[PDB]
Design an enzyme around this catalytic site. Structure first.
Site, mmCIF file in Angstrom:
data_model
loop_
_atom_site.group_PDB
_atom_site.id
_atom_site.type_symbol
_atom_site.label_atom_id
_atom_site.label_comp_id
_atom_site.label_asym_id
_atom_site.label_seq_id
_atom_site.Cartn_x
_atom_site.Cartn_y
_atom_site.Cartn_z
ATOM 1 N N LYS A 185 -59.103 81.268 16.715
ATOM 2 C CA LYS A 185 -59.555 80.607 15.686
ATOM 3 C C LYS A 185 -60.868 81.069 15.182
ATOM 4 C CE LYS A 185 -58.537 75.796 17.488
ATOM 5 N NZ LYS A 185 -57.618 76.295 18.402
ATOM 6 N N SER A 193 -56.577 80.109 21.448
ATOM 7 C CA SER A 193 -57.422 79.585 20.386
ATOM 8 C C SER A 193 -58.618 80.518 20.379
ATOM 9 C CB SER A 193 -58.135 78.305 21.369
ATOM 10 O OG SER A 193 -57.233 77.217 21.140
HETATM 11 C C1 LIG Z 1 -56.388 76.844 22.109
HETATM 12 O O1 LIG Z 1 -56.344 77.642 23.027
HETATM 13 C C2 LIG Z 1 -55.578 75.650 22.166
HETATM 14 C C3 LIG Z 1 -54.694 75.389 23.105
HETATM 15 N N1 LIG Z 1 -54.138 74.203 23.089
HETATM 16 C C4 LIG Z 1 -53.216 73.730 23.952
HETATM 17 C C5 LIG Z 1 -53.665 72.759 25.113
HETATM 18 O O2 LIG Z 1 -54.769 72.595 24.550
HETATM 19 O O3 LIG Z 1 -53.117 72.948 25.923
HETATM 20 C C6 LIG Z 1 -51.818 72.974 23.376
HETATM 21 C C7 LIG Z 1 -50.793 72.775 24.134
HETATM 22 C C8 LIG Z 1 -51.125 73.764 22.231
HETATM 23 N N2 LIG Z 1 -50.725 75.138 22.638
HETATM 24 C C9 LIG Z 1 -51.040 76.137 23.370
HETATM 25 C C10 LIG Z 1 -49.902 76.982 23.802
HETATM 26 N N3 LIG Z 1 -49.000 76.494 23.236
HETATM 27 N N4 LIG Z 1 -49.226 75.335 22.609
HETATM 28 S S1 LIG Z 1 -52.461 71.548 22.408
HETATM 29 O O4 LIG Z 1 -52.864 72.003 21.180
HETATM 30 O O5 LIG Z 1 -51.517 70.498 22.187
#
Ligand SMILES: *C(=O)/C=C/N[C@@H](C(=O)O)[C@](C)(Cn1ccnn1)[SH](=O)=O
Length: 245
Positions: free
Chosen positions: A54, A51
């Site tokens: 972003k 993230s």
């Molecule tokens: C930013 O780092 C968002 C991460 N989102 C993760 C989470 O919050 O655990 C998910 C699982 C998406 N993600 C991260 C790595 N691979 N998928 S969430 O958005 O469903």
């Protein structure tokens, strides 16, 4: 307070040891990089940005008129990972909530060709986005080191990235996460769950009352049953220990 370097190093190492993980935090003061924590070799190793991307996603989308800061991204009514994401939000609200679907929509609007050209122009990490425009920052092939993250944060904090001043200021306004006695902390967290081992990030800068900006990037291994707030706790304790906040 005349605290030795050895004592600062031992204190910050202990914050990572006590969390039962392995990590580093890189701090930049002016042009000098300092690396602390209990796994210093992580400083120049590549990890998916998760993230933290972003920040750049927003810069690219805004600069290329794919969205505005007031635009509401409506929830489409489909089940999302967290109930808090099942709502209509601006890019700024989606930043604070780390709402992946909103940023996936923005990446799709940008499109693969423009995204690859922009990620290259900015020279972000290994600059490779592969062929899937909506997940390259989560599962690869895009990767970046904690040193490159801290240098990215330093460039953003100083309006040095290759985007309009207005674009950079708009994104920076989305990143305010804490105020502490006249200091402001701007940062973006990341949690790469779809890679093994899992990676956690908190990358940003402190703006001190006097206007000075001190960039940092925390990077660690996330584990089962770890809370996301551990990233913030270790970062804040380290910054306090060093007298930065
Ligand atoms: C930013 O780092 C968002 C991460 N989102 C993760 C989470 O919050 O655990 C998910 C699982 C998406 N993600 C991260 C790595 N691979 N998928 S969430 O958005 O469903």
């Amino acid at each position: 307070f005349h605290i030795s370097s050895q004592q600062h190093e031992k204190a910050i190492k202990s914050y990572f040891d006590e969390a039962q993980t392995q990590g580093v935090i890189i701090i930049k003061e002016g042009k000098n990089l300092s690396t602390y924590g209990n796994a210093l070799a992580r400083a120049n190793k590549e990890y998916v940005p998760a993230s933290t991307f972003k920040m750049l996603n927003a810069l690219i989308g805004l600069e290329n008129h794919k969205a505005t800061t007031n635009e509401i991204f409506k929830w489409d009514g489909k089940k999302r990972t967290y109930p808090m994401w099942e709502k209509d939000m601006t890019l700024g609200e989606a930043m604070a909530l780390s709402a992946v679907p909103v940023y996936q929509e923005l990446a799709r609007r940008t499109g693969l060709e423009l995204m690859q050209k922009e990620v290259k122009r900015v020279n972000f990490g290994n600059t490779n986005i592969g062929t899937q425009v909506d997940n390259f920052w989560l599962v690869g092939p895009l990767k970046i080191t904690p040193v490159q993250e801290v240098n990215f944060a330093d460039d953003l904090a100083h309006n040095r990235l290759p985007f309009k001043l207005e674009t950079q200021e708009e994104v920076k306004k989305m990143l305010l996460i804490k105020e502490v006695n006249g200091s402001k902390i701007y940062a973006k967290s990341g949690w790469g769950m779809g890679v093994t081992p899992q990676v956690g990030w908190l990358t940003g800068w402190v703006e001190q009352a006097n206007g000075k900006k001190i960039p940092f990037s925390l990077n660690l291994e996330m584990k089962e049953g770890m809370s996301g707030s551990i990233r913030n706790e270790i970062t804040y304790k380290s910054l306090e220990n060093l007298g930065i906040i």
